[PDB]
Amino acid sequence: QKPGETKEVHPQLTTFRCTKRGGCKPATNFIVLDSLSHPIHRAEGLGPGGCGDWGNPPPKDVCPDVESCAKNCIMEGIPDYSQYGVTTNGTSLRLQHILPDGRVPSPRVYLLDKTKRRYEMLHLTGFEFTFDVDATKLPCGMNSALYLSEMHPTGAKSKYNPGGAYYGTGYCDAQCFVTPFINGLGNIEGKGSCCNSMDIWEANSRASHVAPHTCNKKGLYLCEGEECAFEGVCDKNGCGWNNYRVNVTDYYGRGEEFKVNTLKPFTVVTQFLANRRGKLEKIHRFYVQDGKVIESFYTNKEGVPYTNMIDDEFCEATGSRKYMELGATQGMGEALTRGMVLAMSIWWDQGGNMEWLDHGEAGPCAKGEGAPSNIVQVEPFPEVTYTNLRWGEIGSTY
Numbered sequence: 001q002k003p004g005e006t007k008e009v010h011p012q013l014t015t016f017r018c019t020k021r022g023g024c025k026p027a028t029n030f031i032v033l034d035s036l037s038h039p040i041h042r043a044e045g046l047g048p049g050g051c052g053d054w055g056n057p058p059p060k061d062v063c064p065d066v067e068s069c070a071k072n073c074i075m076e077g078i079p080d081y082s083q084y085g086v087t088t089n090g091t092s093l094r095l096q097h098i099l100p101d102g103r104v105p106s107p108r109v110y111l112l113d114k115t116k117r118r119y120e121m122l123h124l125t126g127f128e129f130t131f132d133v134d135a136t137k138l139p140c141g142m143n144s145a146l147y148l149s150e151m152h153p154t155g156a157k158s159k160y161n162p163g164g165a166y167y168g169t170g171y172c173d174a175q176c177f178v179t180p181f182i183n184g185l186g187n188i189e190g191k192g193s194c195c196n197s198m199d200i201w202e203a204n205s206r207a208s209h210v211a212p213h214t215c216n217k218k219g220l221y222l223c224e225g226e227e228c229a230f231e232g233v234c235d236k237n238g239c240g241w242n243n244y245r246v247n248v249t250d251y252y253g254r255g256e257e258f259k260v261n262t263l264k265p266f267t268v269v270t271q272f273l274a275n276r277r278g279k280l281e282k283i284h285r286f287y288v289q290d291g292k293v294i295e296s297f298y299t300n301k302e303g304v305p306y307t308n309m310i311d312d313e314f315c316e317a318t319g320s321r322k323y324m325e326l327g328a329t330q331g332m333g334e335a336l337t338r339g340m341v342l343a344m345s346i347w348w349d350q351g352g353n354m355e356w357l358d359h360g361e362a363g364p365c366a367k368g369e370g371a372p373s374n375i376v377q378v379e380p381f382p383e384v385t386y387t388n389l390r391w392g393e394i395g396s397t398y
């Protein structure tokens, strides 16, 4: 969509680059909301309304073709990100799901480089990524996410998409969702927006989940028909890693009886360990709280390989078939090596209550507990804060 007259005022966020020799050193980054979360309206004289809702192609009246859509649909800058629940303070990013006035912005943001015109590309195979988090205001059913997608570095800036990454264009993920614009272009044929996704963190105060999701396509692929489906180009389910799912119940939760006590802030470390020819072999998650390293649990479940790291053996044994078919750990690592964009969001699930995150095999949450209608009765204003985003040499971030 065509950028409007309203200014885009990106929140600034300080992050760090770390080495063993130099420690963690500060760097300036910026935060951008998803393009389609910006106000979208029509060109002068065309009346009120937008250019399509999530799940659909854009409307044919204004978007009969890409070229017309590019001129008839206007994407406004956001001059006050706090209106969308997004604020920063030094090295902290706060994402508010619900505002005091009852709006539910459910923000999704990407990390821009210091120029504001290219995403900060992270290349994490053989390195580690670490952050601090306050998860206290995330009950059952909430998903605070911090993850990587293989988006184009300028958001595919082009003739019909002059806005690019500066306006948050180019989103994709392993679900191949249909959005009315893809790569800043009207999605006239209603294709899905597919790409490799590494879910570093999907969590609330009750459960913590890690999952790589492979696709058999590089970068953003516009899928059609069965390509967008379960036996298509991307791994919808991922290879999930959650202590509950591997029969460890005392590792992560609200209270002193959990190794990681989500009533207080903590640090989350993720290492992407490569084999001697440079390909990803293992993904290792551990934590730090109150100045003490909390090593990963090991799996504790009959029929599940004994391990403290995500690898092909574990993924295959736990039924992650599409993960394996669409590239396995090596394929996930090849996407990581090519470069990925960092996305952070907070969201809830009206359909399915986020049961896969924190219910049943996945956590302590009861049936119905994660419904949005109940979430607001438990925590009226869910939010997450991510602090001191930092990445670099193995062993150097913590």
Ligand SMILES: OC[C@H]1O[C@@H](O[C@H]2[C@H](O)[C@@H](O)[C@@H](O)O[C@@H]2CO)[C@H](O)[C@@H](O)[C@H]1O
Binding pocket: 107, 108, 143, 145, 146, 147, 173, 174, 175, 197, 198, 199, 202, 213, 344, 345, 346, 347
């Ligand atoms: O379900 C809608 C939300 O999707 C979130 O993205 C998911 C993504 O679809 C999935 O493949 C995986 O990579 O985990 C992501 C993080 O939970 C968005 O972040 C959120 O904004 C919603 O659109």
Ligand SMILES: OC[C@H]1O[C@@H](O[C@H]2[C@H](O)[C@@H](O)[C@H](O)O[C@@H]2CO)[C@H](O)[C@@H](O)[C@H]1O
Binding pocket: 175, 211, 236, 237, 238, 239, 240, 241, 352, 356
């Ligand atoms: O429900 C959408 C949700 O699915 C997750 O994958 C789940 C899957 O739903 C479930 O059948 C399986 O047993 O566990 C998986 C989690 O390990 C995806 O991970 C998530 O991204 C959503 O797409």
Ligand SMILES: *[C@@H]1O[C@H](CO)[C@@H](O)[C@H](O)[C@H]1NC(C)=O
Binding pocket: 247, 300, 301, 302
């Ligand atoms: C689950 O863990 C408990 C505690 O360690 C153990 O007693 C039990 O046998 C485990 N169950 C399975 C299916 O492995």
